[PDB]
Subunit: 177 residues, 3 copies
């Protein structure tokens, strides 16, 4: 079926340091479609923070929404219902970094990524345990990058863009006892 | 093929990590099924100890078998024929830890897992090289009364953890 | 579709430190198939050096090609076009190690793998950026037909080809 294809798309990546790299291809056609249909939303494959961890999903508005409608690219992340939610602490409080990657060869010039970092609001409600609020609203930036800034370097290359969503590892001390 | 590909897909979800977390949902329906059919066996997805390592499988009796039939949940592990068996040392002698997990929020109370650990017996026929079942485990892993004593059954679901030691 | 089992074979292997273990079964049937069709090439599943890294593929001539046709097994590796090529440095310059494994129990006797190692030449054509420029790189005489039978290289009518790519470790400030 098509859920089988979605499953295989999800397995990149398995609980890998919270790092998802989402390639949005045919950039011009998707941008035209978004300009023709306001509030057109693209969805990344669902990805887990760690093995048996939080299930997250990144979404993008190529023509922007909210304060960025028509002028910017908008980036959001949302917690999804996961099979292991009962084994994780809530609310979700792991630091997240969005990045629009500069597709430049690292050997000829240092890339300048458009990077932003945020800490989940304990009161954002969506970062609370799934199934508590029967919003459904991702958290992020409506003005992540402007339409003019996205053409200023190698952000769009071969009609494709790269969005890197990295979730921070908590790191703790023992315990021991 | 589609059903068998679903199978292979849920096999990939595990690793290679050596840590398997097996979620058994609709606990009540399956417990009644096991009570209606003695020795009814549930099977975990096959999972590898490491990349290109031993292929293992966990099996469970929700109504118990052997000394625990009708009173306990029984947990066993068995070695399966793996594609890389000719590249591994035998007999399988890596420490194994079974856990029935307490589905409690770690931020509100520290969970109390029901854990058991064993080292593979060199003379247990199943831990020998396949072809050159015979599962090993505990018939009295947890009693029917103790499995209701905390958050072991939550939202009609149970979690069986099987952790294999690193080389 | 059937193309999905192919991708399930792929990512059952890729993410690891550039280490692909390719199991070629029914060795005898495929060997006489290659003997019946010169230059018959077997292909490993595509595998990535790291997550979002280079996409590589190993290929084999069971009856050999080039200087080893009819006498040896020939082993090659090739860079394939990957979705993240624009985020990687070129040319590919990660050291590669081929190994034919001696399928012997490591606890009763030490295996003797047939191992060869190379560092990719920066002026090699295939190691340049895919599309922005098929000649794989490798060994035509990796192992002879007689040497592949001398130990447990062929066991239970199966062979194991290990291709390991070395990872770097560059770093900066605090
Ligand atoms: O209002 C939003 N976000 C924030 N407000 C404050 C901080 S982040 C917002 C708007 C539209 C969305 N469409 C899809 C997914 N998530 C969305 C989130
Ligand atoms: O007798 C068993 N185990 C032990 N005997 C002694 C120590 S552990 C036993 C019983 C039932 C099983 N059903 C399925 C798979 N494996 C099983 C193993
Ligand atoms: O000429 C080759 N390799 C080298 N030449 C010099 C050093 S390694 C060669 C020959 C045949 C091939 N057939 C398929 C894939 N790759 C191949 C590579």
């Amino acid at each position: 079926m098509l859920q089988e294809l979605r499953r295989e798309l999800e397995e990149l990546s398995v609980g890998s340091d919270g790092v998802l790299i989402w390639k949005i291809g045919s950039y011009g056609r998707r941008l035209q479609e978004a300009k023709a249909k306001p509030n057109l939303e693209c969805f990344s494959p669902a990805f887990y923070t760690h093995k048996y961890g939080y299930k997250l999903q990144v979404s993008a508005f190529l023509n922007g929404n909210g304060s960025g409608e028509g002028t910017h690219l908008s980036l959001y992340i949302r917690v999804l219902p996961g099979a292991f939610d009962n084994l994780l602490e809530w609310p979700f409080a792991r630091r997240v970094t969005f990045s629009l990657l500069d597709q430049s060869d690292p050997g000829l010039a240092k890339p300048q990524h458009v990077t932003e970092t945020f800490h989940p609001d304990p009161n954002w409600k969506n970062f609370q345990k799934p199934g508590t609020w029967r919003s459904s609203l991702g958290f992020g930036y409506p003005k992540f990058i402007s339409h003019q800034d996205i053409r200023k370097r190698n952000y769009v290359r071969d009609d494709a863009v790269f969005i890197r969503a990295a979730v921070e590892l908590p790191r703790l001390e023992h315990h021991h006892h």
